[PDB]
Amino acid sequence: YYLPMVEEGESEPKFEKFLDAVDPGRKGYVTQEDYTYFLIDKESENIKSSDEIENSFQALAEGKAYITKEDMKQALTPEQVSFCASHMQQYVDPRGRSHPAGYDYVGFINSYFG
Amino acid sequence: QFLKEQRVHLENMGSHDIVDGNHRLVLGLIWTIILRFQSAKDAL
Amino acid sequence: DDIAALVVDNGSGMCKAGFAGDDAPRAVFPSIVGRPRHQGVMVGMGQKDSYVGDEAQSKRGILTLKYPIEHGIVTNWDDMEKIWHHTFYNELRVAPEEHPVLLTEAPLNPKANREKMTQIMFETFNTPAMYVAIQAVLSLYASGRTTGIVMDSGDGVTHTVPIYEGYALPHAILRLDLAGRDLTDYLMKILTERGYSFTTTAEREIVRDIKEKLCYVALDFEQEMATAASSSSLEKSYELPDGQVITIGNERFRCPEALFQPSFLGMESCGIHETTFNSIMKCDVDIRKDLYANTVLSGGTTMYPGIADRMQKEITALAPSTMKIKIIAPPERKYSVWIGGSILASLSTFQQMWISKQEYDESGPSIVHRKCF
Ligand SMILES: Nc1ncnc2c1ncn2[C@@H]1O[C@H](COP(=O)(O)OP(=O)(O)O)[C@@H](O)[C@H]1O
DSSP states (O other): OOOOOOOTTOOOHHHHHHHHHHOTTOOSOOOHHHHHHHHHHHHSSOOSOTHHHHHHHHHHTTTOSSBOHHHHTTTSOHHHHHHHHHHSOBOOOTTOOOOSSOBOHHHHHHHHOO | OHHHHTTOOOSSOOHHHHHHTOHHHHHHHHHHHHHHOOOHHHHO | OOOOOEEEEEOSSEEEEEETTOSSOSEEEEOOEEEEOSOOOOTTSOOOSOEETHHHHHTGGGEEEEOSEETTEEOOHHHHHHHHHHIIIIISOOOTTSSOEEEEEOSSOOHHHHHHHHHHHHHTSOOSEEEEEEHHHHHHHHHTOSSEEEEEEOSSOEEEEEEETTEEOGGGOEEEOOOHHHHHHHHHHHGGGGTOOOOSHHHHHHHHHHHHHSOOOOSSHHHHHHHHHHOSTTOOEEEOTTSOEEEOOGGGTTTGGGGTOGGGTTOOSOOHHHHHHHHHHTSOSTTHHHHHTOEEEESGGGGSTTHHHHHHHHHHHHSOTTSOOOEEOOTTTTSHHHHHHHHHHTOSGGGGOSEEHHHHHHHGGGHHHHSOO
């Protein structure tokens, strides 16, 4: 897992989010099934909810609010990449400026699956 | 020898070639110089 | 348009290199590697492990000359890497990462030669694209005709290949291991009869200079023997580097005659004229009269004075009398292959045929057999 560790007096939110997904009650311990549920939801195949698609195109975009076709083309067939480029719009950042290559998955997912 | 210390690869280069005034080897030396001279620790 | 490609001809004797789209190569230099053999006593002169190319020719007195390419095959790959590095950096002064390279090699060669050449030109020099071509096809480009049989004789190997209307017949390609180095060795052997003895590798270049300067192909062999026996008008005088004067005489037209009669060397194979005729007869019936009219000579070994008349007369004797035989020898036939390379390297339709770096990465060095030829 891409988790930087032991920064000099700094707090990161990835480990906190993982701990909340595993043990939301802050029990301090994870059982065999508590980690197995995370492993099963992280491993493969079937999907329960669209929220994992929501925050997994964020991880595919490496935390960026916009994604590119080149980033999508190391994981996905160019058939589906052409589909995505045809049906998903251009990204607008919080500053308001528009990249020519900026693509928003948030609006697309909330439009089709919401 | 200082250039060889920096592991810059020179071929068919000699001191007597530079002293004698050979054109091609001098130009090659200049060309080669131009190309080649411009805790978390505990967790891992 | 964008960046121009590099054209490199690696014959067995001499290496030639230049930019694509140019008329003549920029760098022409012998393919030798020299290393010293005596003791070194002067402290502070600096060291030099190897002498590459022309630099080894001037200081050849204190070196043992070694040839990396033998009979068209690369035997010592390290010296080939040294020669290629010297060509790229000292002779042309170009970074190899920006340019594609086009290379030349013989018709019939071992597979490992091409595989190792592709691996070397991709792995170390990091060229973006590369290609391998047959030398005689490039000669047919240099001539500018679509149909003909082309015979190329270098320092390593002689080969004949016929091409009709852009299609090359693979079963009619003939390869013969009789070239300029064998003629140089035969000249070294027959110069013993007059009393001159050359043994070390330094004197081989002197014998080669003698052969290039004072040798010619006799039109009629026995008549020239009679003439040289009758008079002394055929003798010529040459001056050695140390100042002695030698006089060849009879051996001027006996060294290049050995191409037409390989039994002088002990070889069982036929002459070059019979090889060309047999390679013509291996083809089909309908294209033979076109091949008779478009015979092309290529390579440096065919630069003897009087080679064209002897070849035309021999092939006229062997062929049926009802057809005409013409031999097309351009005056600049030494560099013909390289010129053809330039004509190939900057065609618009050729740009889709380079071996891409990604293709090599995903295919290994075995991609060169699927492409090229
Ligand atoms: N002017 C010449 N006359 C006769 N023979 C020559 C001449 N120039 C070169 N040669 C012969 O051709 C050889 C060089 O041929 P070259 O074209 O360099 O072969 P390759 O390029 O295929 O190695 C020399 O070894 C020499 O024997």
